[PDB]
Design a protein around this ligand. Structure first.
Ligand code: COA
Length: 276
Protein backbone atom coordinates (compact mmCIF):
# COMPACT_ATOMS: atom_id res chain seq x y z
CA UNK A 1 0.00 0.00 0.00
CA UNK A 2 1.28 3.42 -1.06
CA UNK A 3 -0.83 6.34 0.15
CA UNK A 4 -0.44 9.25 -2.28
CA UNK A 5 -0.76 12.79 -0.91
CA UNK A 6 -0.82 15.06 -3.97
CA UNK A 7 -0.39 18.76 -4.64
CA UNK A 8 -2.86 20.70 -6.80
CA UNK A 9 -1.27 20.24 -10.24
CA UNK A 10 -4.22 21.22 -12.46
CA UNK A 11 -7.56 23.03 -12.31
CA UNK A 12 -10.42 22.15 -14.67
CA UNK A 13 -12.33 25.27 -15.69
CA UNK A 14 -14.86 24.74 -18.46
CA UNK A 15 -13.01 23.02 -21.31
CA UNK A 16 -9.62 24.19 -19.99
CA UNK A 17 -7.19 22.11 -17.92
CA UNK A 18 -4.78 24.69 -16.47
CA UNK A 19 -1.51 24.06 -14.57
CA UNK A 20 -0.92 26.51 -11.64
CA UNK A 21 2.32 28.56 -11.42
CA UNK A 22 2.29 28.76 -7.61
CA UNK A 23 0.63 27.25 -4.53
CA UNK A 24 -2.77 28.61 -3.45
CA UNK A 25 -4.32 27.91 -0.03
CA UNK A 26 -7.56 26.23 -1.23
CA UNK A 27 -9.10 24.78 1.95
CA UNK A 28 -9.39 21.28 0.48
CA UNK A 29 -8.27 17.81 1.51
CA UNK A 30 -5.03 16.46 0.05
CA UNK A 31 -5.82 13.22 -1.76
CA UNK A 32 -4.45 10.72 -4.25
CA UNK A 33 -5.81 12.97 -7.02
CA UNK A 34 -4.18 16.21 -8.22
CA UNK A 35 -7.05 18.19 -9.79
CA UNK A 36 -10.03 20.26 -8.71
CA UNK A 37 -12.93 21.65 -10.76
CA UNK A 38 -13.45 25.42 -10.83
CA UNK A 39 -16.91 26.47 -12.00
CA UNK A 40 -16.43 29.21 -14.61
CA UNK A 41 -19.37 31.26 -13.31
CA UNK A 42 -19.37 30.85 -9.52
CA UNK A 43 -15.66 30.18 -9.19
CA UNK A 44 -16.54 27.49 -6.65
CA UNK A 45 -14.06 24.59 -6.27
CA UNK A 46 -14.89 20.86 -6.20
CA UNK A 47 -12.84 17.73 -5.53
CA UNK A 48 -15.09 15.58 -7.72
CA UNK A 49 -16.59 15.96 -11.19
CA UNK A 50 -19.89 14.59 -9.92
CA UNK A 51 -20.19 17.23 -7.20
CA UNK A 52 -19.27 19.91 -9.73
CA UNK A 53 -21.98 18.68 -12.11
CA UNK A 54 -24.61 18.63 -9.36
CA UNK A 55 -24.03 22.33 -8.61
CA UNK A 56 -23.64 23.29 -12.27
CA UNK A 57 -27.29 22.35 -12.82
CA UNK A 58 -28.44 24.93 -10.26
CA UNK A 59 -30.11 28.06 -11.62
CA UNK A 60 -27.44 30.79 -11.48
CA UNK A 61 -26.74 34.08 -13.28
CA UNK A 62 -24.17 33.71 -16.07
CA UNK A 63 -21.89 36.68 -15.35
CA UNK A 64 -19.97 38.13 -12.38
CA UNK A 65 -22.10 39.32 -9.40
CA UNK A 66 -21.96 43.11 -9.69
CA UNK A 67 -23.24 46.21 -11.48
CA UNK A 68 -22.47 46.42 -15.21
CA UNK A 69 -20.82 49.84 -15.45
CA UNK A 70 -19.44 49.44 -19.00
CA UNK A 71 -20.78 47.54 -22.00
CA UNK A 72 -19.62 47.67 -25.61
CA UNK A 73 -19.86 45.18 -28.47
CA UNK A 74 -16.74 43.33 -27.29
CA UNK A 75 -16.55 43.40 -23.45
CA UNK A 76 -18.47 44.21 -20.26
CA UNK A 77 -17.09 45.43 -16.90
CA UNK A 78 -18.77 44.54 -13.61
CA UNK A 79 -17.99 46.45 -10.39
CA UNK A 80 -18.16 44.29 -7.25
CA UNK A 81 -17.92 45.38 -3.60
CA UNK A 82 -15.94 42.62 -1.88
CA UNK A 83 -17.96 43.20 1.30
CA UNK A 84 -21.21 42.49 -0.60
CA UNK A 85 -19.98 39.36 -2.39
CA UNK A 86 -17.61 37.75 0.08
CA UNK A 87 -17.81 34.16 -1.10
CA UNK A 88 -17.42 34.92 -4.82
CA UNK A 89 -14.56 37.37 -4.28
CA UNK A 90 -12.73 34.97 -1.94
CA UNK A 91 -13.02 32.34 -4.66
CA UNK A 92 -11.65 34.82 -7.20
CA UNK A 93 -8.66 35.55 -4.93
CA UNK A 94 -7.86 31.83 -4.49
CA UNK A 95 -7.87 31.42 -8.26
CA UNK A 96 -5.71 34.53 -8.75
CA UNK A 97 -3.10 33.32 -6.20
CA UNK A 98 -2.35 30.26 -8.38
CA UNK A 99 -0.72 32.73 -10.78
CA UNK A 100 1.01 35.08 -8.28
CA UNK A 101 4.17 34.74 -6.17
CA UNK A 102 2.31 36.47 -3.29
CA UNK A 103 -1.12 37.92 -2.49
CA UNK A 104 -2.74 39.49 0.53
CA UNK A 105 -4.80 37.05 2.66
CA UNK A 106 -7.46 35.71 0.27
CA UNK A 107 -10.19 35.62 2.92
CA UNK A 108 -10.28 39.34 3.72
CA UNK A 109 -12.03 40.89 0.69
CA UNK A 110 -13.93 43.76 2.38
CA UNK A 111 -11.32 46.46 1.71
CA UNK A 112 -11.46 45.93 -2.09
CA UNK A 113 -13.54 46.76 -5.14
CA UNK A 114 -13.22 44.17 -7.92
CA UNK A 115 -13.55 45.17 -11.61
CA UNK A 116 -14.21 42.01 -13.64
CA UNK A 117 -14.09 41.95 -17.44
CA UNK A 118 -16.08 39.50 -19.57
CA UNK A 119 -15.98 38.79 -23.28
CA UNK A 120 -19.42 38.35 -24.80
CA UNK A 121 -20.21 36.12 -27.76
CA UNK A 122 -23.03 33.93 -29.05
CA UNK A 123 -22.67 31.82 -25.89
CA UNK A 124 -23.00 34.75 -23.46
CA UNK A 125 -20.48 36.09 -20.91
CA UNK A 126 -17.04 34.54 -20.24
CA UNK A 127 -14.86 35.91 -17.43
CA UNK A 128 -11.42 36.70 -18.88
CA UNK A 129 -9.76 38.86 -16.19
CA UNK A 130 -10.03 41.42 -13.40
CA UNK A 131 -8.31 44.10 -11.37
CA UNK A 132 -8.83 44.79 -7.69
CA UNK A 133 -8.55 48.27 -6.13
CA UNK A 134 -8.38 49.46 -2.52
CA UNK A 135 -11.45 51.40 -1.42
CA UNK A 136 -8.95 53.62 0.40
CA UNK A 137 -5.27 53.63 -0.62
CA UNK A 138 -2.74 55.69 1.33
CA UNK A 139 -0.49 55.72 -1.74
CA UNK A 140 -3.32 56.46 -4.18
CA UNK A 141 -2.74 53.19 -6.04
CA UNK A 142 -5.38 52.79 -8.81
CA UNK A 143 -4.87 49.01 -9.07
CA UNK A 144 -3.99 46.53 -6.30
CA UNK A 145 -3.70 43.31 -8.37
CA UNK A 146 -4.48 42.67 -12.07
CA UNK A 147 -4.91 39.26 -13.77
CA UNK A 148 -5.85 37.83 -17.14
CA UNK A 149 -6.82 34.16 -16.76
CA UNK A 150 -3.98 32.07 -18.28
CA UNK A 151 -6.22 30.47 -20.95
CA UNK A 152 -6.86 34.02 -22.23
CA UNK A 153 -3.40 35.62 -21.85
CA UNK A 154 -1.56 37.36 -24.73
CA UNK A 155 -4.83 38.22 -26.52
CA UNK A 156 -4.83 41.93 -25.56
CA UNK A 157 -7.17 41.68 -22.54
CA UNK A 158 -4.59 42.84 -20.01
CA UNK A 159 -4.15 46.12 -21.85
CA UNK A 160 -7.92 46.64 -21.82
CA UNK A 161 -7.95 46.06 -18.05
CA UNK A 162 -5.21 48.66 -17.55
CA UNK A 163 -6.92 51.13 -19.86
CA UNK A 164 -10.17 50.75 -17.90
CA UNK A 165 -8.43 51.31 -14.55
CA UNK A 166 -7.19 54.70 -15.80
CA UNK A 167 -10.65 55.64 -17.06
CA UNK A 168 -11.85 55.29 -13.43
CA UNK A 169 -9.04 57.53 -12.22
CA UNK A 170 -9.90 60.10 -14.92
CA UNK A 171 -13.56 60.15 -13.88
CA UNK A 172 -12.27 60.54 -10.27
CA UNK A 173 -10.17 63.61 -11.21
CA UNK A 174 -7.06 61.91 -9.75
CA UNK A 175 -3.74 60.52 -10.99
CA UNK A 176 -2.86 56.95 -10.00
CA UNK A 177 -0.38 54.10 -10.52
CA UNK A 178 -0.46 50.32 -9.83
CA UNK A 179 0.57 49.05 -6.38
CA UNK A 180 4.30 48.26 -6.07
CA UNK A 181 6.20 46.08 -6.09
CA UNK A 182 4.86 44.73 -9.40
CA UNK A 183 5.61 41.31 -10.94
CA UNK A 184 7.86 41.35 -14.00
CA UNK A 185 4.93 40.45 -16.25
CA UNK A 186 2.77 43.13 -14.62
CA UNK A 187 5.42 45.82 -15.02
CA UNK A 188 6.25 44.99 -18.64
CA UNK A 189 2.52 45.23 -19.48
CA UNK A 190 2.33 48.67 -17.83
CA UNK A 191 5.42 49.93 -19.68
CA UNK A 192 3.86 48.89 -23.01
CA UNK A 193 0.58 50.56 -22.07
CA UNK A 194 2.30 53.79 -20.97
CA UNK A 195 4.41 53.77 -24.12
CA UNK A 196 1.44 53.18 -26.48
CA UNK A 197 -0.50 55.92 -24.67
CA UNK A 198 2.15 58.64 -25.13
CA UNK A 199 2.70 57.60 -28.76
CA UNK A 200 -1.02 57.77 -29.53
CA UNK A 201 -1.37 61.23 -27.93
CA UNK A 202 1.56 62.63 -29.94
CA UNK A 203 0.02 61.54 -33.23
CA UNK A 204 -3.68 62.12 -32.49
CA UNK A 205 -3.68 65.17 -30.19
CA UNK A 206 -0.66 67.47 -30.39
CA UNK A 207 2.95 67.21 -31.65
CA UNK A 208 4.25 68.75 -28.40
CA UNK A 209 2.54 68.16 -25.03
CA UNK A 210 3.39 69.28 -21.48
CA UNK A 211 3.53 67.06 -18.38
CA UNK A 212 0.39 68.71 -16.91
CA UNK A 213 -1.46 68.15 -20.17
CA UNK A 214 -0.47 64.49 -20.34
CA UNK A 215 -1.42 63.92 -16.71
CA UNK A 216 -4.79 65.61 -17.24
CA UNK A 217 -5.57 63.52 -20.31
CA UNK A 218 -4.39 60.14 -18.99
CA UNK A 219 -4.32 60.15 -15.14
CA UNK A 220 -0.73 58.87 -15.40
CA UNK A 221 1.58 60.11 -12.61
CA UNK A 222 4.50 62.46 -13.28
CA UNK A 223 6.87 59.63 -12.36
CA UNK A 224 5.42 57.13 -14.85
CA UNK A 225 5.24 59.80 -17.58
CA UNK A 226 8.89 60.82 -17.14
CA UNK A 227 10.18 57.23 -17.02
CA UNK A 228 8.29 56.43 -20.24
CA UNK A 229 9.39 59.63 -22.00
CA UNK A 230 13.05 58.98 -21.17
CA UNK A 231 12.83 55.40 -22.43
CA UNK A 232 11.42 56.68 -25.73
CA UNK A 233 13.92 59.55 -25.90
CA UNK A 234 11.14 62.11 -26.34
CA UNK A 235 11.69 64.42 -23.36
CA UNK A 236 12.48 68.09 -24.10
CA UNK A 237 12.23 71.66 -22.80
CA UNK A 238 10.04 74.01 -24.88
CA UNK A 239 8.29 77.31 -24.06
CA UNK A 240 9.63 77.21 -20.51
CA UNK A 241 8.62 73.70 -19.41
CA UNK A 242 9.19 70.01 -20.02
CA UNK A 243 7.31 68.40 -22.90
CA UNK A 244 7.24 65.21 -24.93
CA UNK A 245 7.55 65.62 -28.69
CA UNK A 246 6.78 63.78 -31.92
CA UNK A 247 9.49 62.40 -34.22
CA UNK A 248 9.77 59.86 -37.05
CA UNK A 249 10.41 56.97 -34.64
CA UNK A 250 7.13 57.72 -32.82
CA UNK A 251 5.19 57.99 -36.09
CA UNK A 252 6.54 54.60 -37.17
CA UNK A 253 5.64 53.04 -33.82
CA UNK A 254 2.14 54.51 -34.07
CA UNK A 255 1.60 53.06 -37.54
CA UNK A 256 2.77 49.62 -36.42
CA UNK A 257 0.44 49.87 -33.42
CA UNK A 258 -2.58 50.78 -35.57
CA UNK A 259 -1.72 48.02 -38.04
CA UNK A 260 -2.41 45.52 -35.26
CA UNK A 261 -6.10 46.50 -35.30
CA UNK A 262 -6.59 46.07 -31.55
CA UNK A 263 -9.67 46.88 -29.45
CA UNK A 264 -9.70 49.79 -26.99
CA UNK A 265 -11.93 51.14 -24.21
CA UNK A 266 -14.45 53.85 -25.22
CA UNK A 267 -14.59 56.37 -22.34
CA UNK A 268 -18.07 57.43 -23.46
CA UNK A 269 -19.49 54.05 -22.46
CA UNK A 270 -18.28 54.19 -18.85
CA UNK A 271 -21.47 54.94 -16.90
CA UNK A 272 -20.14 55.58 -13.41
CA UNK A 273 -19.84 58.15 -10.60
CA UNK A 274 -17.18 57.96 -7.86
CA UNK A 275 -18.54 57.31 -4.31
CA UNK A 276 -18.49 60.94 -3.10
C1 COA B 1 0.18 41.01 -16.54
C2 COA B 1 -0.97 40.32 -17.28
C3 COA B 1 -2.30 40.77 -16.67
C4 COA B 1 -0.96 40.70 -18.76
O1 COA B 1 -2.18 40.25 -19.35
P1 COA B 1 -2.30 39.79 -20.89
O2 COA B 1 -3.76 39.67 -21.23
O3 COA B 1 -1.44 38.58 -21.18
O4 COA B 1 -1.67 41.10 -21.61
P2 COA B 1 -1.77 41.49 -23.18
O5 COA B 1 -2.32 40.31 -23.95
O6 COA B 1 -2.42 42.85 -23.24
O7 COA B 1 -0.23 41.66 -23.62
C5 COA B 1 0.68 40.59 -23.36
C6 COA B 1 1.54 40.23 -24.57
O8 COA B 1 0.74 39.56 -25.56
C7 COA B 1 0.83 40.24 -26.81
N1 COA B 1 -0.44 40.17 -27.56
C8 COA B 1 -1.59 40.82 -27.29
N2 COA B 1 -2.51 40.49 -28.22
C9 COA B 1 -1.93 39.61 -29.07
C10 COA B 1 -2.38 38.88 -30.27
N3 COA B 1 -3.65 39.04 -30.73
N4 COA B 1 -1.51 38.07 -30.90
C11 COA B 1 -0.25 37.93 -30.43
N5 COA B 1 0.19 38.58 -29.34
C12 COA B 1 -0.63 39.42 -28.65
C13 COA B 1 1.20 41.67 -26.44
O9 COA B 1 1.89 42.31 -27.52
C14 COA B 1 2.13 41.44 -25.28
O10 COA B 1 3.35 41.00 -25.85
P3 COA B 1 4.80 41.55 -25.42
O11 COA B 1 5.45 40.35 -24.76
O12 COA B 1 5.41 41.99 -26.73
O13 COA B 1 4.49 42.71 -24.48
C15 COA B 1 -0.79 38.80 -17.19
O14 COA B 1 0.57 38.46 -17.52
C16 COA B 1 -1.08 38.20 -15.83
O15 COA B 1 -2.32 38.03 -15.44
N6 COA B 1 -0.07 37.82 -15.05
C17 COA B 1 -0.11 37.19 -13.72
C18 COA B 1 -0.75 38.19 -12.75
C19 COA B 1 0.23 39.25 -12.25
O16 COA B 1 1.44 39.03 -12.19
N7 COA B 1 -0.30 40.42 -11.86
C20 COA B 1 0.45 41.58 -11.32
C21 COA B 1 -0.41 42.33 -10.30
S1 COA B 1 -0.49 41.60 -8.63
Amino acid sequence: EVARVRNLNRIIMGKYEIEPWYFSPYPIELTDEDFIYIDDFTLQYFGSKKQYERYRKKCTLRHPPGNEIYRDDYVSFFEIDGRKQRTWCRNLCLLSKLFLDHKTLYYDVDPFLFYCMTRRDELGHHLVGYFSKEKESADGYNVACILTLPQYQRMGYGKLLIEFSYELSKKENKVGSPEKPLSDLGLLSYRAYWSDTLITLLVEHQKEITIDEISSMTSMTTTDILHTAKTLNILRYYKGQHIIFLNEDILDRYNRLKAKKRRTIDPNRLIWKPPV
